[PDB]
Design a protein around this ligand. Structure first.
Ligand SMILES: [Ca+2]
Lengths: 223, 11
């Protein structure tokens, strides 16, 4: 997260870190057994780390749970990044408490201008590389269809949306992929892609979770 | 260029 702020320990209790001997992506807890992340974050050997603040220190409140299923959307296209969503099933149910909690799925799509909270342990610099120990947060608005397509012509599908700031300086970045965009208590977005981070006229692009609620429910119910 | 925001994919 570039241009954001320190969230504070466990203030984003649905935020998880995906770990393979290092943090490589985020995710969002949607019930005691299931995490939503990005399809492009798929790999073998994922350990889900819940209740994290400082990802490099055992502070208390952590739960480390192996992924038992990692389900990439069958129509994920690795070239266009359309359908960039993955469900992870935890080997055992997380213990839910104030510091580890699920986030609600949307009942409808959000509109342009709606403030959202984007969080993660990604790069904090738009030029070069600095990775934080603690969770970073950013408040960012959803952009209109017209500004999103203007920014990225021929690239925005119906399953994507833009959020952030066209003036530059504030964005998600490398290491934030898979993490939450939460708007009025609903998981509307998954950190997916963009041209660089926090660049002028190049906002972040996010998987449009409201298009996948039915698929998520159907997939969980059958697994 | 467009890239995913994972550690450590660009197009
Ligand atoms: Ca920790």
């Amino acid at each position: 997260i570039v241009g954001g702020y320190t969230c504070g320990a466990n203030t984003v209790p649905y935020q998880v870190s995906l770990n393979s001997g290092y943090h490589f992506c985020g995710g969002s807890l949607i019930n005691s057994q299931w995490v939503v992340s990005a399809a492009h974050c798929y790999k073998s050997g994922i350990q889900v780390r819940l209740g994290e603040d400082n990802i490099n220190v055992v502070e208390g409140n952590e739960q480390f749970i192996s992924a038992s299923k990692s389900i990439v959307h069958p129509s994920y296209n690795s070239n266009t990044l359309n359908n960039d969503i993955m469900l992870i099933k935890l080997k055992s149910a997380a213990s839910l408490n104030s510091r580890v909690a699920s986030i609600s799925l949307p009942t409808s799509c959000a509109s342009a201008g709606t403030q959202c909270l984007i969080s993660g342990w990604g790069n904090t610099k738009s030029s070069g590389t600095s990775y934080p120990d603690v969770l970073k947060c950013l408040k960012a608005p959803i952009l209109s269809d017209s500004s999103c397509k203007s920014a990225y012509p021929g690239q925005i599908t119906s399953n994507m949306f833009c959020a952030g700031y066209l003036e530059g300086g504030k964005d998600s970045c490398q290491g934030d992929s898979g993490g939450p965009v939460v708007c009025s208590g609903k998981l509307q977005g998954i950190v997916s892609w963009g041209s660089g981070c926090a660049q002028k006229n190049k906002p972040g692009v996010y998987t449009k979770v409201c298009n996948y609620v039915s698929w998520i429910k159907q997939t969980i119910a059958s697994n | 260029g467009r890239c995913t925001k994972s550690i450590x994919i660009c197009f």
